[PDB]
């Protein structure tokens, strides 16, 4: 077939969110009752199908805590040093239930400075103290309550801790039973020791009251919040990866602009080979062939989308891409054959778009722009025309690339950059929870319409219908002047 | 066929009003002579193919009176209490010919307050008086003319009514013969009694002069204006329905966002089972399958459209919908097999759109936005830039849902809403009659072009032709500066 | 085939000017050398494929003179009385060579008032005088030169005409030979008489110098400018037609909004039957079937287009129409079978559009909006933002209908109108000739590209290629700021 | 097949840049390593696939020097006299290595005026002097250093040149060896003479240091910069061509609006016949048939595109054209059969567009608008709203045609023009090099995505995917406010 490539140049046709509507269907299930949980793997389980993009304007520790608390996942960005990125991961892991099996501790010879340091770093209200670092016999605890009486923090621990026997509990004490012990004895902390009195761990009422406050939290087997981390394909990738895995990261995202590059495929094999059980998310790919190549290399999740991002110019400057809905569907067709979930990354303006990507076969969606004006996002708020804004930049933008996204665009050494992205700003949105509430609300409605009691049914079942540009103008509100909008719509 | 659902995801294609034009055809019938009447059922017969949407910004008693007087139908909204909604229905039923068979009456021991109450409630110029409530022997009539001489309304009826024998007439006296009796004896009221003088009814010149004033009125077998009423699927639906049926409502609209929901199907069976002859309009559905399921459940009219409304965000936030012209056609294809009419609800900007929906198979169209700035619509007029406006909100909007449209979106108990609609404003349009005149005028022209002497011919015969976006720009006025517009166009 | 009509509803697809480009082709012919002439019939022959629409804002006598002088045809509108419309036709016929065979004349007993009247009415510089009305012996001529010495015009002709034998010439003297006689004897007028001296006719240097000034003029066999006239389908149509034919009109346009109406078909048969040789243009039709029905009724030209006009709302308000390029092609396919030419009426914004309509099979195009700001058009110039404007209204607009276009919309008696058109304004364009120069220039270029030495080759040969909306944005100028435009483009 | 032409009128469908995206593919090659060189012929070899359009607002000598220095090609425009155009070509040829084999020289009897003239004309820092014009024995050199001591330039050379034996070198001395000789003896000039001392040539450090400064330069076998020149089809074409060939032009562009015109085909045969080895670029053509006809006539490169230009109105005014991507593909399909390269001329807004045209089969792209605001372009900078602009006009614009582009539009003698183009302005872009850097950068990224190590692989391999208008809005940045843009994007 000498001329086959040449003749098939223009045959393919793609579709995106605005070309298409979901067709309503026979439904015995109400929006209220549907299940929105998704399993990306046995060690990664979300209560909502949402991930925040690793981007320096989108996700850092607080955003990751917030997302995890709602049931989704944050991906900490790589535009910081290895020490810095692993420190962020650790903060997220230790937000709740973090010191139960692996406590920090001090000796009476440390200064109050150290105790202030740990408490502020992890937001944990007390620090257990041991006789020395070898034996680790618990001698007492310095807490936030002890702290308010201390003026100069340069003093040694032994001076501020007045002994009284404090209530401790055996190893493997559990939240539910710690809940009554704290209640019964009227205490906020519960050190865990063995029969020899050696400190094994610590439980706080925060650990307990956070379970009540965020009942939908996405957590590992130990009850700690899930967190992911971005890693590029660079000579230092394994080093970055090593420190992440030691910080108990639940997933890495190997993040590149072209997932089908041999360099990416090799890095995945090399990472899978060193960490057989590590959750590995790899992207971006827009095709079936690319999807199969990442999976065979050992990726256990595949991230889909080339160019669709609100801030990306890849399609404009390089001329390259696939319309996102076709991309998701093309990639989901392949990954389904392997029982592998895909992430739809980029292009989602409204909650409806999310529904469409999930009905096209994605297990989960990853959002940049809808999360950047949110309160937990890294940047602070800027003023334009009296209203508050937050900066949002493409990983392809010159600004982002100077701060270490260069490898993503294969620009890694270059003195003069050629950006695939742009810089912009988004309105301040308030706390993340409210944005998720609307997102999940729109999903529940659509699943209601499509008769899907859970996300699996939705991917396997839901049917779309294509429309014209005139079909799009009908779908939006039209030809009436809008006095007041909604959180779901503009 | 394991993979069939998966592969058919993107095959369907929809069309809306702007994608399409009607093809002109051999015509011996002029616009002037065509028949625009439609039968939704033997007990529901419209002289124009128009219904006003039950929405709190669109239809209440006056709008329903106005619509009925022009030949269409109002649907009173449910965003009021059951007492309040049935009271509205009653006002519409009693506007004309309402007391002929079931008169109100008083005894001389009532106060003038009561007489003022009835006259103001029904806009009827006089109140018959009977000796007591059991016998009901007519002793006389207090009228608007008697009223102008009364200062304090706290006084008893017996004091103000000076006896003179008044002209009465036998039962079953008819408008045409009442017309000459009032004329012959020079009177405005004509009580109806039996041989024992027991009040049976009342006829007024208003009853007579309204037939002359609105020759196209849509009326039941008794000559009273038709009226419909909205009912949601709620634990209290039957209660609401019971009071409506007792107020002589001609149709209920069971109104939900997803008509294909099992909960809706069951409610229809349950209502059909209790009221075999009640006119039951059920929606909304966008498909053939949904249409068949409502009909088998006992719906005798089906209402079509998901998302197309000027104020709806359903398609944007939930991602769900079908382009309205395809929806109408898909649903009309199914209902035709059963001899069941469909209503096209939502999306109509211009009179031409109306024609297209009817040629696509709808028996009738239901309009929200084109009727909201009209004088008879419930809200009053707001000022923006010196011009008068009227508020118009989607039943999906937060505002509407707080006032009781929540059940429509399956949000019925929810503390935090996720709206499918938005709030806006429309220009004040003057009296309803002028808007209907243009609507019906555009319909008559199109039927002229398509060679259709009536609406049936139009549904069975008319052919469309699809066009591009460039085809749409040609169809509108283009590339000339508009100095003055028209009532039909912008 | 019970369900065939129902299923074929959406199958048809139309195209308009903006959906399509002409494909360039092998060309040995330069723009300069191509022939742009068209034959609508043996008695109607244009040197350019252009007609001005009969509309009260577009064509009256001067516009018709101007158009004819350039090689096209004016259609005088019917929004004036029968006397008035025939008077306009007569002015156009008599502009050049009008008195050669049928001269006006006076007797010495007429007042100078009469002579002033004729000269001003026809713009002819002199009036022949005869002894009396029966014999018609030429006694002399009162001219513009005689006039400048006359103060009071109330005086009798005999008083101002001082006799000198004047040079006359025999009947059937021709322009070329009159040209030398006027030159040889140094005179501006040349009365024509017989051997008995009875006035037969008159020739002026204007008649001669106009042939030189407008070498491309569209003229009848007698050398008089061609003119057309609009006629509606009304009880008075034949009366209007009779006076037109007596004024030597070359064509009538039976003009209706729906050409496929039985009423129009019957009127054409009835007119064809009374005037077998009259040129009859009938429209509007958008289909093949309609085209065949008009032709069999006796129309010898068919006018095509429903809704495409810059000022028409027909498609919006009635929902009715066909995209103009498909309309032209569909109608041209049918008329070609009969050797019948079609006119493309409406929708042409640029000279390129014209080329496309002709390549789609139209013999000629009819322009409203491109001719309304022209100097010869009936309205005068209005001021908006310091620049000069001309009003332009759709025959469907309320304004036009009040002035007698009602029958066109089948509204003929109606107290309350339902308009198919709108009112607007266009910039003042200067003399018509400059607008035609650009129009014809664009046509010559396109015919150059398509390799067409004449219009026939262009209709039979030229191929189009369809494009998207993105194809349209490429075709226009894009993405550069325009400092100065051109007469061909915006 | 009597009716075949008639029925095939609407079947063809075209695509342009915005309808289409490139599909990413398996890639072992990084953007950094890909080869962007193209061979238009053995005597024309570019290091980047870029040509600047011959247009009076785009390319003259400096632009041609700049383009050649970056690896592309300038085409000097024809809107100047033959002397003037050949002088421009000569300046480009002599920028580097121009006097090595064919030196200018003077005799001591010339004035310093002559020496100033040559140095300023060619930007060469010194002028060799010979005893007389026949023998041509080198007696010395007047340089820029000698010049700074001279006040009145009217004096004879012999007076200012103080003799010292100067270092010369044999014929065929090469840059690399001249580089050390200049270094060893500390001199900036190196005259070349034979054994009899007859001046053969000259080498300067500029010749040497330019090779280092512009390592990617596009050069002929002699090491001189490549340059092209525009020629129209006119009675004087050969004369213009003769002087160009004598100035050592590397290519002529026979430039016409319709390449398929017999007049163009004949001119190509006639030019090919007189200059069998001359590089001949001919256009414009949009079709396969036109492409084959130019090639058989002797064109060795074909230039593609009718109407797509940012400033062209051809499609609007003449209605003529083909969407550029289809045009390139249709023409590349034909030329590939002959081993003939095509140029994509017009329509490229962004670097991505460039990639698409090359993947559609073009060997090279030709840019007008992207190069007009560049510093080396002929016009100077205009002020609008405080920012600097550069005028850019279409060769079809009235302005350009008055200055001699008339023949291109077959308007060659015409008193009154009918333009195919428009006049506008573009922002000042700074030095050309920066614009090329971004252009080449975008190309390298796209080739990275498509897995193409060189341009051949890209044409033979790369696959596109079609998208809707909604697909285009996704591809651009969407729905976020842009605070700062990039050089690649807007």
DSSP annotation string for A198-224: BEEEEEEHHHHHHHHH-TT--B-TTSP
Q: Is the peptide bond before D162 cis (omega within 30 degrees of 0)?
A: no
Decide: A306 and A320 in contact? Cβ < 8 Å.
Answer: yes
Placement of tokens 């929809």 in the chain: B14
Nearest-by-Cβ selection for A310 from D20, D442, D477: D477
Identify the bridge partners of residue B90 per DSSP, sorted by sequence position.
none
Residue of C nearest to D319 (CA): C352
> What chain B residue is nearest to C319 in terms of C-alpha separation?
B352
Q: Are A188 and A204 in contact (CB under 8 A)?
A: yes
Q: Do C308 and B474 touch (CB under 8 A)?
A: yes
Q: Is C312 a catalytic residue?
A: yes
Between CA C319 and CA B488 the distance in angstroms is 12
Pairing mode, strands A138-143 and A126-130: antiparallel
Neighbours of D210 (CB within 10 A): 19
Q: Spell out where C144-278 has E strands.
A: 169-170, 189-193, 199-204, 228-231, 251-255
Q: Is C148 annotated as a binding residue?
A: no
How many other C-beta atoms lie within 10 A of the C-beta of residue A175? Answer: 15
* Cβ contact D226:D240 at 8 Å: no
Altogether, the residues listed in chain C come to a count of 490
Q: Are residues C398 and B486, on separate chains, in Cβ contact within 8 Å?
A: yes
Question: CA D144, D149, D152: angle at the middle one, nearest 5?
Answer: 100
Q: Tell me the resolution in Å.
A: 2.6
Instruction: Give me the helices (H) in D247-303, please.
Output: 262-274, 288-296
Active-site residue flag, D331: no
Residue of B200, B179, B175, B197 whose CA lies nearest to B188: B179
Touching C: which chains, 3+ CB pairs < 8 A?
B, D
Neighbours of chain A (3+ CB pairs under 8 A): B, D
Cα gap B82→B252, rounded to integer Å: 13
Tell me the residues of chain C between 302 and 331 that have a Cβ less than 8 Å away from chain D: 329
| Cα nearest neighbour of C14 on chain D | D10
| A contacts of D450 (beta carbons < 8 Å) | 320
Q: Does A445 touch chain B (CB under 8 A)?
A: yes
Q: Using only the alpha carbons of chain A, give its radius of gyration.
A: 25
Going from N- to C-terminal start, the domains of chain B cover 1-490
Can you tell me which residue has the tokens 């009109």?
Answer: C249
Candidates B49, B450, B468, partner chain C, best to mutate (most C CBs within 10 A): B468
- CA B222 to CA D338: how far, in whole Å? 88
**Beta strands B126-130; B387-393: pairing state:** unpaired
Interchain CB distance below 8 Å, B463 and C307: no
Return the residue in C7, C9, C473 with the most chain B beta carbons within 10 A, the one to mutate for interface testing: C9
> Is there a contact between B356 and C287 if contact means CB atoms under 8 Å apart?
no
Q: Which three-class secondary structure state does DSSP give residue A311?
A: coil
The minimal CB distance from D13 to the residues C30, C444, C465 is found for C465
DSSP state of A62: H
Give how far the C-alpha of residue A163 lies from the chain's centroid of Cα atoms, to the nearest Å.
43
Provide the 10 A C-beta neighbour count for residue B274.
12
Catalytic residue chosen out of the listed positions C136, C312, C425, C444: C312
Burial class (CB in 10 A: 0-12, 13-18, 19+), B399: buried
Q: Between chains, do A410 and D448 touch, taking CB under 8 Å as contact?
A: yes
Q: Is A361 annotated as a binding residue?
A: no
Q: Considering only CB atoms, which chain D residues are within 8 Å of A398?
A: 486
- A461–chain B Cβ distance below 8 A for any pair: yes
DSSP string computed for A248-301: T-SEEEEE-S-TTBHHHHHHHHHHHHH-TTSEEEEEEE-SHHHHHHHHHTT-SE
**Which of B69, B224, B240, B408 is an active site residue?**
B408
Tell me whether residue A266 is annotated as binding: no
Between the two ends of chain C, the Cα-to-Cα distance in Å is 51
Q: Return left, alpha or beta for B385; rule: phi > 0 is left, psi -120 to 50 is alpha, else beta.
A: left
What torsion, rounded to 10 degrees, do the Cα atoms D101, D106, D107, D111 define?
-170
- What's the CA gap between A218 and A40, in Å, rounded? 12
Best CA proximity match to D441, nearest among A416, A264, A398: A416
Paired tokens of C477: 């100028």
> Residue D482: which of A369, A418, A422 has the nearest Cβ?
A422
Q: CB burial class (10 A; 0-12, 13-18, 19+) of residue B194?
A: middle
Secondary structure of residue A388 in the 3-state scheme: strand
- From CA C268, how far away is CA C272, in angstroms rounded? 6
Reduce the DSSP state of residue C191 to 3 states and report it.
Answer: strand
Exposure class string for B212-249: b at 16+ Cβ within 10 A, else e:
eebebbbbbeebbbbbbbbbbbbeebbebbebbbebbb
Cα C278 to Cα C268: distance, rounded to the nearest angstrom: 11
Quote the minimal CA–CA distance from B150 to chain C in Å: 45
Tell me if C399 is assigned to a ligand binding site: no
Using a CB-CB cut-off of 8 Å, the residues of chain B touching C424 are 477, 480-483
Residues 6+ apart with CB under 8 A from A386: none
Residue C251 CB contacts under 8 Å (≥ 6 apart), including other chains: C40, C44, C73, C75, C226, C228, C229, C278, C279, C280, C281, C301
* Facing residue for A13 by CB, picked from D351, D466, D482: D466
- What method did the depositors use to determine the structure? X-ray
Interatomic CA distance for residues A74 and A51, integer angstroms = 6
Which residues of chain A lie closer than 8 angstroms to D461, CB-CB? 5
* Spatial separation of the C-alpha atoms in residues A268 and A259, rounded to whole Å: 10
Which DSSP letter does residue A423 get? E
By DSSP bridging, strand D481-484 and strand A423-427 are antiparallel
Cβ of A21 and B425 within 8 Å?
Answer: no
**Does D21 reach chain A within 8 Å, measured CB to CB?**
yes
Going through D262-376 in order, the beta strands assigned E by DSSP cover 279-285, 301-304, 342-345, 364-367
Which chains does chain D touch, 3 or more C-beta pairs < 8 A?
Answer: A, C
Q: Is A470 on the interface with B (CB under 8 A)?
A: yes
Say if residue A345 carries a ligand binding annotation: yes
* CATH topology (fold) of D1-490: TIM Barrel (3.20.20)
Q: Alpha-carbon Rg of chain C, whole angstroms?
A: 25
Q: Which residue of A has its CA nearest to D16?
A: A10
In which residue are the tokens 């616009």 written? Answer: B31
Q: Are B85 and B237 in contact (CB under 8 A)?
A: no
Q: From its phi and psi, is residue C451 left (phi > 0), alpha (psi between -120 and 50) or beta?
A: left
- d(C-alpha B351, C-alpha B443), whole Å: 7
What is the rounded distance in angstroms from the CA atom of residue C378 to the CA atom of residue C364? 23
β-strands D381-384, D364-367 pairing: unpaired
CB count in 10 Å sphere of residue D209: 13
CA distance A273 to A250: 17
Distance from the A260 Cα atom to the nearest Cα atom in chain D, whole angstroms: 5
* Mutation for testing the C interface, residue in D2, D9, D353 having most C CBs under 10 Å: D9
CB B396 within 8 A of CB B313: yes
The Cα A214–Cα A224 span in angstroms is 12
Any CB–CB contact under 8 A between A9 and chain D?
yes
D310, two tokens: 């940012």
Phi-psi group of C477: left, alpha or beta (phi > 0 → left; psi -120 to 50 → alpha; rest → beta): beta
Of the candidates A14, A260, A394, the beta carbon closest to that of D465 is on A14
Show the CA angle centred on residue C236, arms to residues C233 and C237, nearest 5°: 45
Q: Give the H/E segment covering residue C344.
A: strand C342-345
Cα distances from B215 to residues B70, B437, D352, in angstroms, run: 8, 14, 67
**Among C94, C408, C444, C459, which one carries the catalytic annotation?**
C408
Residue A271, phi-psi category: left (phi > 0), alpha (psi -120 to 50), beta (remainder)? alpha
Residue A451 sits at the chain B interface (C-beta within 8 Å): yes
Breaks (C-N over 2.5 A) in chain B follow: none
Judge whether A422 is closer than 8 Å to chain D, CB to CB. Answer: yes
The residues, any chain, with a CB within 8 Å of residue C217's CB and separated by 6 or more, are: C47, C68, C69, C70, C71, C96, C210, C211, C225
């Amino acid at each position: 077939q000498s001329n086959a490539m040449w003749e098939s140049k223009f045959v393919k046709e793609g579709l995106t969110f605005d070309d298409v509507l979901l067709v309503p269907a026979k439904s015995d299930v109400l929006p209220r009752e549907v299940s929105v949980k998704t399993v990306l793997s046995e060690s990664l389980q979300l209560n909502i199908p949402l991930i925040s993009a690793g981007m320096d304007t989108v996700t850092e520790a607080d955003m990751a805590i917030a997302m995890a608390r709602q049931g989704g996942l944050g991906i900490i960005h790589k535009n910081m040093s290895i020490e810095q990125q692993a420190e962020q991961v650790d903060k997220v892991k230790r937000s709740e239930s973090g010191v139960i099996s692996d406590p920090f501790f001090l000796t009476p010879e440390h200064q109050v400075y150290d105790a202030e340091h740990l408490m502020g770093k992890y937001r944990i209200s007390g620090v257990p103290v041991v006789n020395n670092l070898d034996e680790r016999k618990l001698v007492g605890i310095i807490t936030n309550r002890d702290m308010r009486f201390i003026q100069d923090y340069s003093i040694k621990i032994s001076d501020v801790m007045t002994k009284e026997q404090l209530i401790t509990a055996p190893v493997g004490t559990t939240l539910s039973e710690a809940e009554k012990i704290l209640q019964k004895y009227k205490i906020e902390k519960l050190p865990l020791v063995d029969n020899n009195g050696v400190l094994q761990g610590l439980i706080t009422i925060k650990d307990i009251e956070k379970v009540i406050e965020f009942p939908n939290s996405a957590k590992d087997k130990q009850g700690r919040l899930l967190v992911g981390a971005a890693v590029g394909v660079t000579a230092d990738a394994m080093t970055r990866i090593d420190a992440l895995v030691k910080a108990s990261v639940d997933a890495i995202v190997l993040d590149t602009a072209h997932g089908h590059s041999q360099g990416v495929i090799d890095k995945v094999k090399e990472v899978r080979a060193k960490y057989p059980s590590l959750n590995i998310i790899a992207g971006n790919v827009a095709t079936a062939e690319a999807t199969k190549a990442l999976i065979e290399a050992g990726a256990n999740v595949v991230k889909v989308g080339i160019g669709p991002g609100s801030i990306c110019t890849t399609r404009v400057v390089a001329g390259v891409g696939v319309p996102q809905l076709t991309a998701v569907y093309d990639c989901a067709t392949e990954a389904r054959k392997h029982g592998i979930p895909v992430i739809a990354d980029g292009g989602i303006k409204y909650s409806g778009d999310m529904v469409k990507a999930l009905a096209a076969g994605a297990h989960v969606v990853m959002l940049g722009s809808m999360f950047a004006g949110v309160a937990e996002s890294p940047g602070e708020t800027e003023i334009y025309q009296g209203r508050q804004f937050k900066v949002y930049r493409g990983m392809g933008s010159v600004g982002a690339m100077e701060k270490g996204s260069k490898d993503r665009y294969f620009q890694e050494g270059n003195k003069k950059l050629v950006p695939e992205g742009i810089e912009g700003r988004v309105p301040y949105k308030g706390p993340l929870a409210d944005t998720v509430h609307q997102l999940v609300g729109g999903l529940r409605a659509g699943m209601g319409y499509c008769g899907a009691q859970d996300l699996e049914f939705l991917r396997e079942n839901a049917q779309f219908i294509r429309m014209s540009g005139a079909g799009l103008l009908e779908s939006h509100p039209h030809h009436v002047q809008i006095t007041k909008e909604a959180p779901n719509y503009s």
